[PDB]
Design a protein around this ligand. Structure first.
Ligand SMILES: [Ca+2]
Ligand SMILES: [Ca+2]
Ligand SMILES: [Ca+2]
Ligand SMILES: [Ca+2]
Ligand SMILES: [Ca+2]
Ligand SMILES: [Ca+2]
Ligand SMILES: [Ca+2]
Ligand SMILES: [Ca+2]
Length: 615
């Protein structure tokens, strides 16, 4: 069973998602929009020939963004925007007075490290209140490397020393960081929480980078310190170089091409620390790609991947974390994801988005396996799936998809979306159920694509060899300059339809409701009952029975040695159909949670591996 890539302990899926959203919000907030100028410059001028312009904007911003430098009156107030965002997520800073904390805070309510050597550490303490004013949860956020704009360089230097000591320091250095920086604070927060009838489980702890380290550190100290109050707290660490994994306390979320993420093995420095370090850790999301201008670029990647290679640090910036991982969380495909799902996140600049395909390059990382999820942006994307099974999500904007094979789901989202086959249309079987486009390639691979207005092919003649041709996707068929080419389909609607296949139908679409789909002597038919509980009457040979997403509870008659079952994007993580099967008298039931299909008069030992696709 799939729990979502950001699944945490034993939480139900929605609780995990909600927690993830809170953690990312407070983790981001700790940086006070320090990378706001970089966000603007990156998107505007990129990471190539425009890089010099990007870097300057990162330092002094514009009238639309604030760089690292404070006090320029033509910049917007990015601190106010930072506070607005965290407050919109449901959080507000709790004051030292509210805590009765005797330590140091600044005018923005930020808490500072308590011990010599840790005084450039920063933490945020926030609360979520009900519409009634009662305290409901507490959030603890640790800042990564950097500090308030007004003391940026000095503070950053302090942090870098702490960073170096985590790799080159005492074995216990990383583990002690949070105890030494915020030992007293955390005690006061515990007393505060308790006075408000809250327990360790009402606390979310997060942070990015060095702040990620700090998350794992608190977790490491939480059984023995603070009366054990934070033992069962929720620890969500972003881009941490370290992992504390004993007791299942922490989830470590980051991008695999972020050289800081998992740079240390546990807390140890190893050879791979200075290079590629993509060995999978139990607590970590090991296969999320930040598909940005650096990652996309062959030229950039002639240089070895390394935390010592400064350009690679692009993938670490907190705005990529905030924006990219929220799209992952909000993805229409989220409930199909697991901790180690291969997820490619589009994070291109405006300079490259229109001429660069977002795809699994698998660069500087262990070989990916399992399905691949590619998450678009709300801009106009070029998205390309591989030869395996892909889940491509366009989101807003006018998106173009390509896919190299296998079994796939595509969500065009809003906008005018194109599916580009990259070859002669005659090489692809195309049908449509009124909403979803079905494409079957020459090897039997099947793609379901929603919100596609145009099917693009590449055609040729004895004269011209690469003409691109668009076909408007209409209910009546594909419309082109050559005319209107209908689908070989019988198509039902919202009702409980009875569909008998006619001579040249190749597809039966029940759509919503409880439909009866009846085959014909010639076989070679694809049955798609759709949602609702459908009856599928297979006749003759070479029939395909296709099921996707929540396909309801179907009954399949007539199944034989020459027929095929295809499940795409369905409940259950197993790739082995035996794991879904139970024999009920003469009937074989393949159960998929809320969906299932009962094959009447069939037993599992009569079904070969060629007859079933789990994708
Ligand atoms: Ca700092
Ligand atoms: Ca990986
Ligand atoms: Ca898009
Ligand atoms: Ca779109
Ligand atoms: Ca594919
Ligand atoms: Ca129907
Ligand atoms: Ca149906
Ligand atoms: Ca159905």
């Amino acid at each position: 069973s799939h729990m979502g890539i950001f699944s945490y302990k034993d939480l139900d899926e929605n609780a995990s998602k909600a927690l993830f959203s809170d953690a990312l919000a407070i983790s981001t907030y700790a940086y006070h929009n320090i990378d706001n100028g970089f966000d603007e410059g990156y998107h505007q001028t990129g990471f190539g020939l425009g890089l010099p312009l990007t870097l300057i904007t990162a330092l002094i911003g514009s009238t639309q963004s604030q760089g690292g430098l404070p006090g320029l009156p033509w910049n917007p107030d990015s601190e106010q925007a930072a506070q607005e965002a965290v407050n919109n997520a449901g959080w507000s800073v709790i004051s030292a007075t509210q805590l009765g904390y005797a330590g140091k805070t600044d005018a923005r309510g930020t808490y500072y490290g308590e011990t010599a050597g840790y005084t450039t550490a920063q933490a945020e303490v926030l609360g979520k209140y009900d519409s009634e004013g009662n305290l409901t949860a507490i959030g603890i956020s640790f800042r990564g490397t950097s500090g308030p704009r007004e003391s940026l360089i000095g503070d950053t230097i302090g942090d870098v020393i702490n960073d170096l000591l985590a790799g080159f320091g005492p074995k216990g250095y990383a583990d002690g960081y949070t105890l030494k920086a915020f030992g007293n604070l955390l005690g006061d927060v515990a007393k505060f929480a308790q006075a408000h009838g809250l327990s360790g489980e009402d606390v979310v702890v997060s942070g990015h980078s060095l702040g990620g380290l700090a998350v794992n550190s608190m977790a490491a100290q939480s059984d023995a310190n603070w009366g054990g109050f934070y033992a069962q707290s929720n620890y969500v660490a972003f881009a941490s170089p370290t992992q504390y994994e004993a007791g299942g306390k922490v989830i470590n979320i980051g991008y695999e091409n972020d050289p800081v993420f998992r740079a240390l093995d546990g807390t140890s420095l190893t050879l791979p620390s200075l290079g590629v370090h993509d060995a999978p850790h139990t607590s970590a999301t090991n296969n999320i790609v930040n598909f940005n201008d650096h990652y996309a670029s062959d030229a950039w990647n002639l240089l070895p991947f390394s935390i010592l290679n400064i350009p690679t640090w692009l993938s670490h910036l907190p705005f990529f974390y905030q924006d990219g991982l929220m799209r992952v969380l909000n993805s229409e495909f989220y409930s199909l994801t697991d901790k180690d799902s291969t997820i490619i996140v589009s994070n291109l600049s405006n300079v490259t988005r229109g001429n660069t395909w977002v795809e699994d390059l698998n660069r500087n990382a262990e070989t990916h396996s399992g399905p691949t999820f590619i998450i678009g942006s709300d801009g106009n994307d070029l998205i390309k799936g591989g030869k395996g099974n892909d889940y491509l999500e366009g989101r807003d904007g006018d998106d173009i998809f390509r896919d190299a094979g296998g079994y796939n789901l595509i969500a065009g989202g809003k906008g005018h979306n194109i599916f580009d086959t990259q070859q002669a249309l005659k090489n692809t079987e195309v049908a449509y159920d009124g909403n979803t486009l079905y494409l079957r390639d020459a090897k039997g691979g099947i793609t379901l694509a929603d919100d596609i207005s145009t099917l693009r092919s590449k055609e040729t003649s004895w004269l011209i060899f690469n003409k691109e041709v668009d076909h408007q996707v209409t209910a009546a068929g594909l419309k082109s300059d050559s005319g209107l080419k209908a689908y070989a389909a019988a198509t039902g609607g919202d009702g409980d339809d009875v569909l008998q296949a006619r001579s040249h139908d190749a597809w039966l679409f029940g759509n919503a409701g409880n439909d009866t789909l009846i085959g014909h002597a010639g076989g070679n038919l694809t049955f798609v009952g759709g949602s609702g509980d459908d009856i599928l009457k297979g006749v003759g040979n070479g029939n395909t029975f296709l099921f996707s997403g929540d396909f309801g509870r179907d009954q399949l008659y007539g199944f034989n040695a020459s027929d095929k079952l295809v499940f795409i994007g369905t409940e259950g993580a197993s790739g082995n159909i035996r794991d879904y099967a139970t024999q009920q008298n003469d009937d074989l039931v393949l159960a998929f949670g809320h969906s299932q299909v009962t094959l009447i008069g069939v037993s599992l030992d009569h079904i070969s591996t060629d007859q079933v696709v789990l994708a």
